[PDB]
UniProtKB/Swiss-Prot annotation, chain B:
GO (cellular component) term, any one: cytosolic large ribosomal subunit
Gene3D superfamilies: 3.30.720.90
Keywords, ordered alphabetically: Acetylation, Cytoplasm, Isopeptide bond, Ribonucleoprotein, Ribosomal protein, Ubl conjugation
Subcellular location per the Swiss-Prot or TrEMBL entry: Cytoplasm
UniProt similarity note: Belongs to the eukaryotic ribosomal protein eL38 family.
Protein name per its UniProtKB record: Large ribosomal subunit protein eL38
Gene: RPL38
One of the GO biological process terms: translation
Source organism superkingdom: Eukaryota
A GO molecular-function descriptor: structural constituent of ribosome
UniProt-listed InterPro entries: Ribosomal_eL38 (IPR002675), Ribosomal_eL38_sf (IPR038464)
UniProtKB/Swiss-Prot annotation, chain C:
Protein name per the record: Large ribosomal subunit protein eL34
One GO cellular component, as annotated: ribonucleoprotein complex
Localization per record: Cytoplasm, Cytosol; Cytoplasm; Endoplasmic reticulum
Lineage summary: Eukaryota, Metazoa, Chordata, Craniata, Vertebrata
Modified residues (Phosphoserine): 11
Primary role: Component of the large ribosomal subunit. The ribosome is a large ribonucleoprotein complex responsible for the synthesis of proteins in the cell.
Annotated organism of origin: Oryctolagus cuniculus (Rabbit)
Keyword Acetylation attached: yes
GO BP: any one term: translation
Length: 90, 69, 114, 50, 154
RNA sequence: AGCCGACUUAGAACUGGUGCGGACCAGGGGAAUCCGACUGUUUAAUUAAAACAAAGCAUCGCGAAGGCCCGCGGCGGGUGUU
RNA sequence: GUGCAGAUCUUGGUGGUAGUAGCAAAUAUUCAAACGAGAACUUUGAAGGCCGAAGUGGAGAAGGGUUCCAUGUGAACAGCAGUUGAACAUGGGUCAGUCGGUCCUGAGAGAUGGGCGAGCGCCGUUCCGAAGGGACGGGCGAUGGCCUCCGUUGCCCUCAGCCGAUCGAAAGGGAGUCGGGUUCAGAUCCCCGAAUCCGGAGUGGCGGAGAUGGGCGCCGCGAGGCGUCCAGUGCGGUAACGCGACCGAUCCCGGAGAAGCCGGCGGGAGCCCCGGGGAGAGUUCUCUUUUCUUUGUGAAGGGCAGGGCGCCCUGGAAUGGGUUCGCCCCGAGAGAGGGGCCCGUGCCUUGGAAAGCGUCGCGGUUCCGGCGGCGUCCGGUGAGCUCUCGCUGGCCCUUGAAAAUCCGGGGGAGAGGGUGUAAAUCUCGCGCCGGGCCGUACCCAUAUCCGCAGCAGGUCUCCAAGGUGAACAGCCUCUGGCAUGUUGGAACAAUGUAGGUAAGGGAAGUCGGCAAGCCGGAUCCGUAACUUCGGGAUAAGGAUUGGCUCUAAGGGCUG
RNA sequence: UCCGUAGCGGUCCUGACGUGCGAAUCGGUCGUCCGACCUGGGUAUAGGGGCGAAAGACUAAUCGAACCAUCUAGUAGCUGG
């Protein structure tokens, strides 16, 4: 088991169940949704984003735009930078 | 079982007519006084070694005492 | 791992033969035969899907044991009807009784001229 | 079964008491023909009806 | 075992302080909290039983009585109804059109609740498989797996 | 910024006498014809089928003192709480 | 009832076959010792093995009925043998208010009224019935005791629905018991310790509640005290509702009992997993701060986590928000704050460390719930498996029981006391007494049941470890269990039965590819004709798969 | 709905066995395995009757009319003594 920690004995040969049987896409989706919705909420009560960007990004998260936490954080920073010119030129 | 928080109600429960026996358990950081009534075993919990000894003299004389070990 | 057996002669997993696991002062795992879960009373109005509040959810013969304050709410129709359908029946009983007085007045208003 | 009734248990009690051998002193009698108990019953062989 | 729904209607007894419970066959459009009226002087609305001699010609009824006072026998399957054709004030007779199309002369004093029976169009959906027919007739009676007589022995 | 933890996925290098789902577990495939739509059922102990059933389709009777049926007989009974 | 050689004659007995067929389904036994006249088979120890948590394990239902347990025997049985047995012979063994029966009704069975019938009887279960033997308040009458005040029965007035007597479930409904110890065999039953349910009460055993408040007139400096006139069937919160009680009948309303199947998610246990501390074992030829075992608390009560709410208050929302895995919710009031209720099987405490367990050591020379010293500790995790609770959704031309029994409410007939040794009353806390009858042992299945039997058949359930692996698959192992399935030894011929392997050819065999063989998991691509557009489809076709050393990516907690 | 375990069933080898483990079993191979699914207990239908997704199947190893007793020592132009 200490070698399965490193990644040993889990190649193509020593693998008998399907990809969904070993790691279900439903629990992968549920962990990703809970992580991304936790991040969006924590960015909302910390006043980093407001109610309109939170509601806009919630539906994009549910519609599968962002693949993990980091690409969501970069996209939030890009939107904050693009809002920071609209609220600077007006 | 019932736990008596105060000392004053313990004297009434020991002075009840149906109090069959009273027994004193001496363990660490605690002294336990147990009155065996008709329905419940009433327990008084004392974390003061001075008050335990004065209460041990303050038991009523008509009640049968069994100092446990 | 200590596999455990039933403590009664009923060996079938019926609704009354329901158990739970319990750890014992002798350091062993036993079955304890549980009681069925109780239900709070449903409101006498018949429309509210929720059950009443302030009343304990027990089996029906446990209600012999309990005192009255554990079985009702200090209100008219308390412990038998929800407060929403109590106040919506107070309003209804007042307003239809008022409208009957209006109809009685309008009857005599017609009979006065005619 | 272990869930017996009173009349069944009493019938089993009598059929238990009749399943003993003959006493040794009966065939020293004068007008005697009995060699052994021919009405005996074993639980595996004869299943007693019921 | 019945395509029609039932309505539990509560009245109050005119002679005793009791609430009386009856099972009517629900006319389509009947909802809960609705007041259902009964008798000769009751108005003509859906779900409102009255004698057929009061209603005009062409009235659509259900749960019609074939004899006066037998609590409803005619046109009470789901989606079915009867139509009042004509009256006859002398001798108290009323002609009605039964859901088979055969016209019947009834007495003028028997009762029928106004409207069609709810749950209509039930035979419109095809039973797709043998299982739904099994579940249908298990709620009614042991008659469904019908063996043809030509497949039997003499 | 620090402290913690769970199993996965992908890629790369090296390496064995090309051996590697190393035991176990574990679909042979294609072109056609006949029949039955299918799922289901059937001769317990020689026939599991193309037989039966099935949904669909189509006729028949009957508006209740009635249609169909039971019963030695009753103001009898089943369908019919129709 | 009189003569046998036959009738596949009847009954009984005995031969050849013949010391023959056979004692071959489920991997397996070996060494030493003991008892004994006697050991392949009994017992003990050491091995080597198997069943491998859907068991050859631990418990029950039906059925069996003493098969259970102790001792003795080896006559007969246990298809070899037996020192052994479920065999025989002597003796023992089943302890309950809480576990079931008992009670209720289900499908249904079944009297009476009635009808039919020659008749035993049959039909019928509310249908052709004067189908209630009850209760509160009053009047009348008697009885017995502080003849005070209740109780008792006799008659009358008053009021009253039911739906059919009765039976029908050791798996449905159904109040209430758990922990330790104890036997050769019985334990939720015996003993000890903790509870709990129901029923009973004139004097009602006590305490508490009902409830002891105000005004006026005097007095007392006041603190407060006498006398009149009244009130008092509780109280708090805006509310959800809460507080230890908190009168009330005939009557009425409602609730609980009382509800299908499947999918998904969340919480809590138990088991498994990882990192350490102890205690005791195992290895140590070399290495291993190493490997294995164990490391806790009942019911009931109280408090607090946690989970749920289709509960309440403020306030009014579009630049629509909140939010799930999916959904879904909202001016019929969302978010945002503040509360309220239910379940709390989780934790803490009383129980409760006194008991239990581990380990070490003393006693009783022993017949001991014997006496002691320590310990029973600290954390982390999980699409894990099982059970349970909860939320939400899907399906139905399927909508998924009744009754016993219990409770709440609406009404207000009545009852109680005149300001107190207050009364009627109490679902509050204690105190007293009782819970009768029947079953309870054991097997529950390759030997205790049914198949003529210790018969490879059949027979309803509960629990369900580690690894590999998608897996309750197959294989190995731990706890527990067993001795290879009605015998052993020696040989290794044919023909068998059950397995395999074969050069070269590849169905030439055969009625016929019968049988056997090829293929097979997973990843990557790739996938036709036809079609009812759903499929066909794992179509067909190929490529890769080990070990080791790495890299990259996929998260929470705190500020 | 498909593969497939437990369960339910019983295709083929026309395998084993066939004075058998067995008056219908065993082995491999097989069909199905969320629904017209499997199953215990209770209850209803009784012999010219029941019940049958229909084979004249099942109705206690008995079914093109079960089983028990009686009529009955039924009759036999037929068989054997
Ligand atoms: Mg998916
Ligand atoms: Mg029960
Ligand atoms: Mg606990
Ligand atoms: Mg309450
Ligand atoms: Mg037997
Ligand atoms: Mg059927
Ligand atoms: Mg035929
Ligand atoms: Mg052709
Ligand atoms: Mg076919
Ligand atoms: Mg056959
Ligand atoms: Mg066959
Ligand atoms: Mg003679
Ligand atoms: Mg002769
Ligand atoms: Mg021989
Ligand atoms: Mg056992
Ligand atoms: Mg067993
Ligand atoms: Mg022998
Ligand atoms: Mg024995
Ligand atoms: Mg006891
Ligand atoms: Mg009868
Ligand atoms: Mg009964
Ligand atoms: Mg019962
Ligand atoms: Mg809100
Ligand atoms: Mg200790
Ligand atoms: Mg009131
Ligand atoms: Mg027992
Ligand atoms: Mg055997
Ligand atoms: Mg063997
Ligand atoms: Mg042997
Ligand atoms: Mg070859
Ligand atoms: Mg070759
Ligand atoms: Mg050829
Ligand atoms: Mg040839
Ligand atoms: Mg083949
Ligand atoms: Mg094809
Ligand atoms: Mg299927
Ligand atoms: Mg399939
Ligand atoms: Mg054969
Ligand atoms: Mg042979
Ligand atoms: Mg054998
Ligand atoms: Mg008949
Ligand atoms: Mg059938
Ligand atoms: Mg035929
Ligand atoms: Mg002739
Ligand atoms: Zn309501």
């Amino acid at each position: 088991t200490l070698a399965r920690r490193k990644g040993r004995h889990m190649g193509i040969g020593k693998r008998k169940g399907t990809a969904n049987a070993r790691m279900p896409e439903k629990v992968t989706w549920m962990r990703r949704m809970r992580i991304l919705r936790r991040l969006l909420r924590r960015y909302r009560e910390s006043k980093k984003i407001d109610r309109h960007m939170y509601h806009s990004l919630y539906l994009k998260v549910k519609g599968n735009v962002f693949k993990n936490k980091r690409i969501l954080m970069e996209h939030i920073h890009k939107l904050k930078a693009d809002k920071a010119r609209k609220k600077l030129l007006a | 079982p019932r736990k008596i928080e105060e000392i004053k109600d313990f004297l009434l429960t020991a002075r009840r007519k149906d109090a069959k026996s009273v027994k004193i358990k001496k363990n660490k950081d605690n002294v336990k006084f147990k009155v065996r009534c008709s329905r419940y075993l009433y327990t008084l919990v004392i974390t003061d070694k001075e008050k335990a000894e004065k209460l041990k003299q303050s038991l009523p004389p008509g009640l049968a005492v069994k100092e446990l070990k | 791992v200590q596999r455990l057996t039933y403590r009664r002669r009923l060996s079938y997993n019926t609704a009354s033969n329901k158990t739970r696991l319990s750890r014992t002062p002798g350091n062993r795992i036993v079955y304890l035969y549980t009681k069925k879960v109780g239900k709070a009373p449903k409101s006498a109005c018949g429309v509210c899907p929720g059950r009443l509040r302030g009343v304990r959810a027990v089996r029906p013969k446990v209600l012999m044991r309990l005192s009255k304050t554990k079985k009702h709410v200090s209100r008219a129709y308390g412990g038998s009807m929800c407060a929403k359908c109590v106040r919506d029946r107070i309003k209804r009983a007042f307003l239809i009784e008022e409208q009957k007085i209006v109809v009685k007045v309008l009857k005599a208003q017609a009979q006065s001229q005619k | 079964s272990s869930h017996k009734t009173f009349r069944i248990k009493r019938f089993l009690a009598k059929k238990q008491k009749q399943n003993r051998p003959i006493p040794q002193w009966i065939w020293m009698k004068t007008g005697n023909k009995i060699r052994y108990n021919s009405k005996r019953r074993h639980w595996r062989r004869t299943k007693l009806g019921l | 075992g019945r395509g029609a729904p039932l309505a539990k209607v509560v009245f109050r007894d005119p002679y005793r302080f009791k609430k009386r419970t009856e099972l009517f066959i629900a006319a389509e459009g009947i909802h809960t909290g609705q007041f259902v009226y009964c008798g000769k002087k009751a108005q003509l609305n859906i779900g409102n039983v009255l004698p057929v001699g009061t209603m005009p010609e062409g009235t659509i009824v259900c749960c019609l009585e074939e004899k006066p006072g037998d609590r409803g026998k005619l046109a009470r399957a789901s989606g079915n109804y009867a139509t009042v054709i004509s009256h006859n004030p002398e001798t108290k007779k009323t002609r009605v059109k039964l859901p088979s199309g055969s016209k019947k002369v009834i007495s003028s004093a028997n009762r029928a609740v106004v409207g069609v029976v709810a749950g209509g169009g039930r035979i419109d959906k095809p039973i797709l498989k043998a299982g739904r027919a099994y579940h249908k007739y298990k709620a009614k009676r042991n008659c469904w797996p019908r063996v043809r007589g030509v497949a039997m022995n003499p």
